[PDB]
Amino acid sequence: SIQAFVFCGKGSNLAPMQHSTRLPKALLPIGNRPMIEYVLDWCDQADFKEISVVAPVDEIELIESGLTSFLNSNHSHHLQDPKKINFISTGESLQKELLPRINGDFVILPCDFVTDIPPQVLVDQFRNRDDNNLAMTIYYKNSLKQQQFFTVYSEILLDVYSQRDVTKTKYLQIRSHLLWNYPNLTVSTKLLNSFIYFCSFELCQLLKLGPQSMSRQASFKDPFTGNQQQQNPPTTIFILPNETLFIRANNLNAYMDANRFVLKIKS
Amino acid sequence: EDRLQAVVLTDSYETRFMPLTAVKPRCLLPLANVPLIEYTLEFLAKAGVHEVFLICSSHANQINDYIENSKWNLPWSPFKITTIMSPEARCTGDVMRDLDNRGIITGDFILVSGDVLTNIDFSKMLEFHKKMHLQDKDHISTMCLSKASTYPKTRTIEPAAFVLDKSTSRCIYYQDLPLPSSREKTSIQIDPELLDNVDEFVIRNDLIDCRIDICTSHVPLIFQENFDYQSLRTDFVKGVISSDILGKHIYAYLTDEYAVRVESWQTYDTISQDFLGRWCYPLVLDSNIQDDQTYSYESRHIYKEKDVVLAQSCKIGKCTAIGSGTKIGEGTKIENSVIGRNCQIGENIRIKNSFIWDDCIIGNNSIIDHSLIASNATLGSNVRLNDGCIIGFNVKIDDNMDLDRNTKISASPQDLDDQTLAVSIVGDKGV
Amino acid sequence: PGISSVIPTVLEQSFDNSSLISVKELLLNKDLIHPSILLLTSHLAHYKIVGSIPRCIAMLEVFQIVIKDYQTPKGTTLSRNLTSYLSHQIDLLKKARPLSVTMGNAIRWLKQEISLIDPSTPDKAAKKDLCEKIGQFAKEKIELADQLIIDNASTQIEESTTIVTYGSSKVLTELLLHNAISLKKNIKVIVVDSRPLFEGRKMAETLRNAGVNVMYALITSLDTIFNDVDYVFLGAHSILSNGFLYSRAGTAMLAMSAKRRNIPVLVCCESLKFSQRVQLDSVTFNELADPNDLVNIDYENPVERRGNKGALLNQFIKERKFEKKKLAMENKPKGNKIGGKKGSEGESKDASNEE
């Protein structure tokens, strides 16, 4: 039932390296070490035998050559390149395509990863607390602005609001039904999602019927609200996401922060 | 640090209690057979007040006479009471300007709206107020808050949502919501002027209002300057936050222990049930504060004063209190209910979750359930009552009378059904 | 293979009869163990609800899942590596939490069933009949037998009565729930609780959810609540050969008071609960747990305080030792309600020979 998924793509946010056909986003040295090495090291620690890797239309054998040569791997990886992806579809269309391969509960983790955290304890929390989703938040730099806002419950630990300030209006707006239930709420500014996602089996029933997901963040975890109307047919446990806070440095790399990760390693 | 003066906001939440406050004042009403003011005064004495101020206008003569009879007119008292007489019925802002014109406020003063019973030690509060005042110069007032009963699903009258700092504990927003009683509004709009100055935003609705304030000498000067502000919470706090004077701060204090302000009837009922229980550890009936009180604790939360008379083969319940000079007849069931001093009770009477104040006579064969009775009022024979049925002063209900849910009875001999005189609108009678 | 030795806190000068250690957070194990076992061991290590009765029911269901998931190898037969795999399960269960008596009778039943079925019948035809038999076995010995205890107690309890209880016993929760709903009596239920586990708190919560007149109390205050009380029900764990009541923590104290204050003690029990191991004092074989559960300062299980206590290893002799399973003295209880209806604890082993 348990299996891990590695999500590979191509970067458009970065300035210089990625535009070349020979070099992909998966194979990039940051601190004299390859990027996908840390993903393989994590999966080896978490104890997973069934790992399947998804790939875009570009780089069909370059990822397969990187997994075989140099890299410790010692695991059977299933690399596939679907043709429905158009870049303008990113990952949700990839998720809707491959669904009969998954037998039970699945873990989604992108290729753009830097990790310095214990892996097994995140898996154990997913297994014990008995819910659909779990996400991780990590602090921004402290050594010598409008970004994004998360809401966290603290006693069971849950997630409610994750929407950014890009298309957000002049005023901060909250709904009453979503506040009256779960009355205590903590809003985070410094804490950021490092793309760690845990998922259950019962997600397979809804992905084939109703296409609603976007960017694997905006309308991925947001369908959870048992509020106001309640109209979408549920799979039978209340649809509820989770969150856990961490101190150590482990975050995403997509923008200008990639140069700061090199400064973090060399110390 | 010593010398502290206090101002008490009375004549503030009148007619919020609908059938009462007709002849006698708001704060005269007993919680546990003892006036609401007495609780507040006990809180003042435990805090360490040297000078007391009171705001009386409506039924002011009865208040002044009660202070004359009080334990604080006597020379040994740590505080002396001086009453402020104002025009009949005015907002809190109008009284603030009146007091600033008179000019008695020195340094740090105290303001309490309504009557609050709490077991929370105030010495800690004063220290943390002073520590935060030494942090920066332009700092104003202090607010008290306590943790709610997990979910406030039964609490509808106080829907106050608070946005607070994790580091400095500064309030950001105040909002009222109709939500569960009236499903109409959902939206709450917040000002984005204080986003990166705070960073650690914490939004909570799970906090109970207290309306107890430690205030600086700035406050009465601001009230006279900005005379548009009528309220002290809804418009004032929000006005202070939203860049009226830049660099000015207001406190929000979190406390784990019990602190609930009285405002409504069903809130009053919960506080009273909390007092009968051992929620307020120091504030218990057996300790006796009014001096005339001679209450003694009995196991299973049963309170009895001295000179309690009871008939044989009678069953008493849980969380009950009975006053002094009280007589009870046979076949009586008293469960989760307060009965006042000098109250004569007939026979075959079943009481559950109800309320009876001082000097009340009840007729034989009557069932009373979750319903309140005021002082010097008599109940007849064959009386059946339901939940939330509040009966006014001196109301004589005659023999054979049935009243349904929420049937409020007037205390003055206006618009609502049932009055003070014999057979109250079951056959047209009443002035 | 597993983690063994190296234990928190002192070895202790007094009381060192049992193991005080074990795996909470999963690190270094065999990659063949069925995850439903791994879930139950992680459950029982920090469990708040279970107390003797429910532990076996879960253990049976987990076994039923394993057999349903079991596919017979082409080389090795059914009775080849199964019993070794089961021995690995029990050893992992032992590492997490010492087993109950009812668990032992289940294992003994299962090992009897392995020997009964010979490797000659087809695989899918075998396991289909096996799980059906286990289901019927669990129906009889637990669910139906429980219902028999219910009705036996129903005749015994008088109309409009006060009952004081202790623990988190499944049989008694259902007993009192039956009294409140089906029979409709004036049952005043008082619940007592200890420090390591808020078992009674959970019971009272569930009784409140039914809508019962519930008082909730502690061991410290008893000579006040008693002076009221009629029948006292105790959550059985195991009754031994002699007729000693091996049960949870604050049980014997209550048993003593009730014997002293006239109206006695009653115990509901299962026919699977009886053992043949015998003892006379609490020291003999105790279910010891780590003082990590006693670190917290009052109120709830997770509070996390910067309090007064914190050190155990570095402190020069500070044994904060608590026990879980105690022994009530023989004479003090009076009634036992089982599969075979009734019988005093003086009789005890009239079920073990009856089988």
Coordinates of N, CA, C and O in Angstrom, one line a residue, chain A residues 1-2 47 49 120-121 124-125 127-128 155, chain C residues 24-27 31 38-39 42-43 300 302:
Chain A
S1 N 0.8 -1.2 0.0 CA 0.0 0.0 0.0 C 0.8 1.3 0.0 O 0.5 2.2 -0.7
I2 N 1.9 1.3 0.8 CA 2.8 2.4 0.9 C 3.8 2.5 -0.2 O 4.5 1.6 -0.6
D47 N 12.8 4.1 4.5 CA 12.5 2.7 4.2 C 11.4 2.5 3.2 O 10.2 2.2 3.6
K49 N 10.6 0.7 -0.8 CA 11.1 -0.2 -1.8 C 10.4 0.2 -3.2 O 11.0 0.0 -4.2
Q120 N 11.6 9.5 9.3 CA 10.7 8.5 9.9 C 9.6 9.0 10.7 O 8.4 8.5 10.7
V121 N 9.8 10.1 11.5 CA 8.9 10.7 12.4 C 7.7 11.4 11.7 O 6.6 11.5 12.3
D124 N 5.5 8.4 10.7 CA 4.8 7.9 11.9 C 3.6 8.8 12.3 O 2.6 8.3 12.8
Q125 N 3.8 10.1 12.2 CA 2.7 11.1 12.5 C 1.5 11.0 11.5 O 0.4 11.2 11.9
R127 N 0.7 8.1 10.0 CA 0.1 6.8 10.3 C -0.8 6.8 11.5 O -1.8 6.2 11.6
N128 N -0.3 7.6 12.5 CA -1.0 7.6 13.9 C -2.1 8.5 14.0 O -3.1 8.1 14.6
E155 N -2.7 22.6 19.8 CA -3.0 22.0 21.1 C -2.2 20.7 21.2 O -2.0 20.2 22.4
Chain C
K24 N 9.4 3.0 20.8 CA 8.3 3.9 20.7 C 8.4 4.5 19.3 O 7.4 4.5 18.5
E25 N 9.5 5.2 19.0 CA 9.8 5.7 17.6 C 10.6 4.7 16.8 O 11.6 4.2 17.3
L26 N 10.1 4.4 15.6 CA 10.5 3.3 14.8 C 11.9 3.5 14.2 O 12.1 4.4 13.3
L27 N 12.9 2.8 14.7 CA 14.3 2.8 14.2 C 14.9 1.4 14.3 O 14.9 0.8 15.4
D31 N 12.1 -6.0 8.1 CA 11.2 -5.5 7.0 C 10.3 -6.7 6.5 O 10.2 -6.9 5.3
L38 N 2.4 -3.5 14.0 CA 3.2 -2.3 14.3 C 2.4 -1.1 14.7 O 2.9 -0.3 15.5
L39 N 1.1 -1.1 14.3 CA 0.2 0.0 14.7 C -0.3 -0.3 16.1 O -0.4 0.7 16.9
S42 N 2.4 0.4 18.8 CA 2.5 1.8 18.9 C 1.3 2.4 19.7 O 1.5 3.4 20.4
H43 N 0.2 1.8 19.5 CA -1.0 2.1 20.3 C -0.9 1.8 21.7 O -1.1 2.7 22.6
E300 N -4.0 17.6 32.6 CA -4.1 16.7 31.4 C -2.8 15.9 31.1 O -1.8 16.2 31.8
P302 N -1.0 15.9 28.0 CA 0.0 16.8 27.4 C -0.2 18.3 27.9 O -1.2 18.9 27.6

